[PDB]
Amino acid sequence: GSPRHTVPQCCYGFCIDLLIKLARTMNFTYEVHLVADGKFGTQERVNNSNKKEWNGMMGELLSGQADMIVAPLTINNERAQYIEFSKPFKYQGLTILVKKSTLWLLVGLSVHVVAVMLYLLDRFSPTLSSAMWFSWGVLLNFSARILGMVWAGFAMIIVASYTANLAAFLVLDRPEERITGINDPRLRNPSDKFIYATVKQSSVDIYFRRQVELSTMYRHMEKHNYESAAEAIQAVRDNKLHAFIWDSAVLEFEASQKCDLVTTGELFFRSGFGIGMRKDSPWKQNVSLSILKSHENGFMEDLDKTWVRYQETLTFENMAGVFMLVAGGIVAGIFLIFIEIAYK
Amino acid sequence: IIVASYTANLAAFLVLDRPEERITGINDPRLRNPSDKFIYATVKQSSVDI
Amino acid sequence: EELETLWLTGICSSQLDIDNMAGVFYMLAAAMALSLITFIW
Amino acid sequence: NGMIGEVVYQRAVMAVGSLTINEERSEVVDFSVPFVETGISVMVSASVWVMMFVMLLIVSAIAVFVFEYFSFTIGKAIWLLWGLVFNNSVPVQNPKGTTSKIMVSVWAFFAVIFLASYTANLAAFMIQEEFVDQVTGLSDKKFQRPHDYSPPFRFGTVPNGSTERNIRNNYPYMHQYMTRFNQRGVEDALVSLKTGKLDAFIYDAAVLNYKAGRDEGCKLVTIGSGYIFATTGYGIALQKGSPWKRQIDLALLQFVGDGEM
Amino acid sequence: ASVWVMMFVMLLIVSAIAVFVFEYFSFTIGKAIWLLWGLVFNNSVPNPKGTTSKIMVSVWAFFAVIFLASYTANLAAFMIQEEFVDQVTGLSDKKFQRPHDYSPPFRFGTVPNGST
Ligand SMILES: *[C@@H]1O[C@H](CO)[C@@H](O[C@@H]2O[C@H](CO)[C@@H](O)[C@H](O)[C@H]2NC(C)=O)[C@H](O)[C@H]1NC(C)=O
Ligand SMILES: *[C@@H]1O[C@H](CO)[C@@H](O[C@@H]2O[C@H](CO)[C@@H](O)[C@H](O)[C@H]2NC(C)=O)[C@H](O)[C@H]1NC(C)=O
Ligand SMILES: *[C@@H]1O[C@H](CO)[C@@H](O)[C@H](O)[C@H]1NC(C)=O
Ligand SMILES: *[C@@H]1O[C@H](CO)[C@@H](O)[C@H](O)[C@H]1NC(C)=O
Numbered sequence: 122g123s124p125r126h127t128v129p130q131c132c133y134g135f136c137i138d139l140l141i142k143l144a145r146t147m148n149f150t151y152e153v154h155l156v157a158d159g160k161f162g163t164q165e166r167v168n169n170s171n172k173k174e175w176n177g178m179m180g181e182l183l184s185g186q187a188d189m190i191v192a193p194l195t196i197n198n199e200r201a202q203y204i205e206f207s208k209p210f211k212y213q214g215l216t217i218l219v220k221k222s223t224l225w226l227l228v229g230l231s232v233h234v235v236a237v238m239l240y241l242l243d244r245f246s247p248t249l250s251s252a253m254w255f256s257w258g259v260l261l262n263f264s265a266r267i268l269g270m271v272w273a274g275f276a277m278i279i280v281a282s283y284t285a286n287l288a289a290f291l292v293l294d295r296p297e298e299r300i301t302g303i304n305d306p307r308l309r310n311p312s313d314k315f316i317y318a319t320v321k322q323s324s325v326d327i328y329f330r331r332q333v334e335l336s337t338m339y340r341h342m343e344k345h346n347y348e349s350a351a352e353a354i355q356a357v358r359d360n361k362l363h364a365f366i367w368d369s370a371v372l373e374f375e376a377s378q379k380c381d382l383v384t385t386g387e388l389f390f391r392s393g394f395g396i397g398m399r400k401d402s403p404w405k406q407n408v409s410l411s412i413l414k415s416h417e418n419g420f421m422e423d424l425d426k427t428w429v430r431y432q433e434t435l436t437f438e439n440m441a442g443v444f445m446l447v448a449g450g451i452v453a454g455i456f457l458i459f460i461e462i463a464y465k
Numbered sequence: 466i467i468v469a470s471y472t473a474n475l476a477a478f479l480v481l482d483r484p485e486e487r488i489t490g491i492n493d494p495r496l497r498n499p500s501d502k503f504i505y506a507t508v509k510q511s512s513v514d515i
Numbered sequence: 516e517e518l519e520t521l522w523l524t525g526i527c528s529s530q531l532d533i534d535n536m537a538g539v540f541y542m543l544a545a546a547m548a549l550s551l552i553t554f555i556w
Numbered sequence: 557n558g559m560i561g562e563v564v565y566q567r568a569v570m571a572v573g574s575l576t577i578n579e580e581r582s583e584v585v586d587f588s589v590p591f592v593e594t595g596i597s598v599m600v601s602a603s604v605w606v607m608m609f610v611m612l613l614i615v616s617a618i619a620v621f622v623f624e625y626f627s628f629t630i631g632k633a634i635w636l637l638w639g640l641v642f643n644n645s646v647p648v649q650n651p652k653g654t655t656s657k658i659m660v661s662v663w664a665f666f667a668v669i670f671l672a673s674y675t676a677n678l679a680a681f682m683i684q685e686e687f688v689d690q691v692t693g694l695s696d697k698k699f700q701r702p703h704d705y706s707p708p709f710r711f712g713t714v715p716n717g718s719t720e721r722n723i724r725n726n727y728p729y730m731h732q733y734m735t736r737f738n739q740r741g742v743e744d745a746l747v748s749l750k751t752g753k754l755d756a757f758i759y760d761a762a763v764l765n766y767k768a769g770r771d772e773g774c775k776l777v778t779i780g781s782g783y784i785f786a787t788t789g790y791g792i793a794l795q796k797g798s799p800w801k802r803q804i805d806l807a808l809l810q811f812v813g814d815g816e817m
Numbered sequence: 818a819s820v821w822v823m824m825f826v827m828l829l830i831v832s833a834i835a836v837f838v839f840e841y842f843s844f845t846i847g848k849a850i851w852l853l854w855g856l857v858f859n860n861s862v863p864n865p866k867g868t869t870s871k872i873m874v875s876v877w878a879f880f881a882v883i884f885l886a887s888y889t890a891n892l893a894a895f896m897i898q899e900e901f902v903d904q905v906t907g908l909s910d911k912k913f914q915r916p917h918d919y920s921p922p923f924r925f926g927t928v929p930n931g932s933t
């Protein structure tokens with residue numbers, strides 16, 4: 122899209138204020154710049170000479186153009202073989218971003234036929250509209266009175282069964298929009314329905330590439346690798362995605378932003394994110410002691426107060442349409458009452 | 466509203482909160498750390514003990 | 516058992532009241548039979 | 557004293573067991589990378605009625621209009637209408653108007669399904685089981701002075717512990733109020749929390765999570781997941797200059813990065 | 818089976834008490850069954866006047882309230898219950914004799930070259 126258009130703009134947030142705290146702590150100035158891509162950095166064979174190389178922030182740090190990766194970098198085994206690490210500042214796990222009759226007409230025809238032969242039983246027994254409005258009072262609430270009270274028992278037991286199966290329809294049979302983590306059997310053998318994906322060239326892809334027992338998920342997310350997580354948020358807001366493997370507190374902050382964003386139940390791979398560092402350097406011991414000093418006090422709670430800690434029945438399920446139907450039935454019956462005006 | 470709450474909490478008391486008369490196998494955490502209440506044993510010198 | 520957990524997946528609505536409504540039809544047929552008895556008196 | 561006295565004075569090599577990490581311990585020896593996330597914790601024990609009112613006035617107005625067309629139900633239809641809202645067969649007035657009978661019958665069926673929805677509301681409130689939280693964390697208003705409330709509650713820590721050092725580096729007045737509230741045994745503090753000889757207890761997070769995960773009946777309830785707490789980790793303490801640190805770090809990253817941990 | 822029997826016996830007892838109310842202190846002699854089993858279901862079919870009759874109707878109506886509560890409990894207990902139907906019981910099935918015995922001609926086979 123934009124090959125070479127690099128401008129100075131204003132950056133702020135969590136790690137920016139963390140670096141401001143570090144500059145307040147120690148004896149240094151700094152120079153904040155960005156990375157050329159939206160990728161952490163993966164080890165891949167370059168096409169010439171058959172050699173595995175890196176890219177991204179690891180490719181820019183080892184090239185000497187950078188000095189310190191101040192980013193929530195994924196700590197794993199392969200990165201520590203080449204560079205050194207500090208104490209982690211972030212501690213979080215992994216999660217999934219998701220998005221959150223005719224029989225009555227038969228009973229009506231039955232009570233119409235019941236009313237008809239009750240009117241017939243009134244006729245054969247040694248008046249008309251009185252029995253009509255009496256049936257209008259009965260169905261909703263001397264030989265004909267016995268059938269009327271037996272049918273009133275029928276009416277109460279039918280509306281009791283109606284209450285029972287409406288409660289059954291609203292409590293038990295609920296569609297599971299959640300996934301409950303990796304242990305969903307429909308995601309173990311996926312299809313074109315449940316769209317789960319991840320960031321292109323992310324460390325989660327390498328972490329699942331080491332896990333050879335779920336290689337089918339490795340062959341499924343490769344068809345839907347996105348460049349940035351904002352693309353995944355834009356695609357899941359427009360209902361193009363269905364699931365997204367990502368860290369916990371970032372999706373919790375996005376759930377605080379947008380209430381429709383829901384995390385999953387399973388909390389696995391409880392890992393930590395630290396600051397990307399160089400090799401053996403005089404900025405290792407002092408900086409780690411400063412990070413531990415930031416851990417021991419309530420400055421982590423202050424950084425939570427900046428962004429992390431701060432956040433941003435109804436009885437209208439299916440009776441709003443019934444409410445409109447009642448209003449429309451009253452308006453439609455007003456014309457029949459005009460017919461009753463013209464009749465009398 | 467009183468008789469509705471009475472129907473609601475009688476159905477609450479009889480439907481859901483049933484005491485667990487079943488154990489569902491070895492994965493009961495109360496059988497992992499037992500006490501003098503859950504009395505469970507087997508035949509002496511049985512192969513189940515082995 | 517771990518291999519069976521790895522290689523097997525042991526898994527496990529709508530309104531229907533045809534038995535209760537069938538009893539309703541049977542009892543109303545009995546009621547109209549009783550009315551047909553009491554018609555002659 | 558203890559493991560610090562064994563490792564710093566070089567009577568051992570490394571501390572594999574559990575150990576909290578603070579500033580001076582990281583000064584005297586070199587910890588490894590943290591593998592488990594173990595912090596600290598504290599153990600303790602609208603328009604619906606508006607639109608109903610609007611359509612109630614609409615139904616009453618239509619009934620009064622039809623009664624003015626075709627014996628006291630002008631100003632008295634409110635009691636009949638709002639009594640047939642609740643559907644309890646209260647003797648009110650004999651319905652003679654056809655519009656009144658049909659419209660109040662439709663309104664009564666709407667009231668029957670409305671009370672069915674209210675029983676559904678009660679069932680949905682019953683399914684949602686509450687979990688109340690008295691103390692939110694270390695920044696509680698209770699954790700300033702127990703004289704603010706009329707029962708003075710009590711809470712303490714483990715003696716000669718690093719939690720006491722974290723309190724004395726955070727709040728020395730908290731240590732002053734804990735000085736009258738000291739105890740000795742972890743199981744003694746557990747029995748004091750169960751029987752009622754202690755209100756709350758400050759300890760580490762994951763050990764109390766394991767004790768609550770095997771407790772008979774789960775009477776004691778934890779507080780959060782370390783949100784207003786330290787939320788630190790445990791590493792492996794090695795001496796300054798040991799060549800074994802890199803291999804242990806690679807082995808820990810192998811143990812975490814495959815699900816075996 | 819005995820539920821309707823005991824409700825019939827207590828209904829005759831209630832009607833006999835209403836007859837006793839008529840013997841002491843209008844048209845509800847044998848009509849006590851009508852208004853009685855009508856006010857079981859709360860139908861408001863077109864009035865108790867006797868004090869004994871009002872107290873007895875109140876006790877029987879509270880019994881009807883807890884009876885319909887128990888019937889909603891029975892409906893919830895049937896709502897928890899969900900079953901499945903099974904045609905073939907095993908190798909001793911009557912389907913394993915002749916498919917002409919049943920009205921749809923069914924079919925079942927195995928894999929070729931198999932030990933089954
Ligand atoms: C906690 O530490 C203190 C020292 O800071 C211990 O107090 C002394 O411990 C020695 C151990 O030999 C005893 O001989 C002394 O008698 C103790 N002093 C007193 C005043 O009793 C203490 O034992 C440690 N134990 C606790 C309570 O956690
Ligand atoms: C069952 O096995 C036999 C092979 O022994 C196959 O049946 C026929 O066998 C003869 C002799 O080998 C071949 O000439 C035929 O071509 C075979 N028929 C077929 C369908 O190829 C048969 O392949 C096996 N069962 C099936 C249906 O696959
Ligand atoms: C930090 O380094 C600068 C280098 O010029 C020096 O002037 C200053 O005294 C040092 N002290 C601080 C402010 O940390
Ligand atoms: C990239 O390098 C690999 C090395 O095997 C080669 O297979 C592939 O074709 C190369 N891609 C290009 C240059 O299109």
Ligand SMILES: *[C@@H]1O[C@H](CO)[C@@H](O)[C@H](O)[C@H]1NC(C)=O
Pocket residue numbers: 406407410
């Ligand atoms: C911090 O840096 C100084 C040198 O600038 C060094 O002497 C000291 O040992 C380091 N450790 C501390 C106190 O953080």
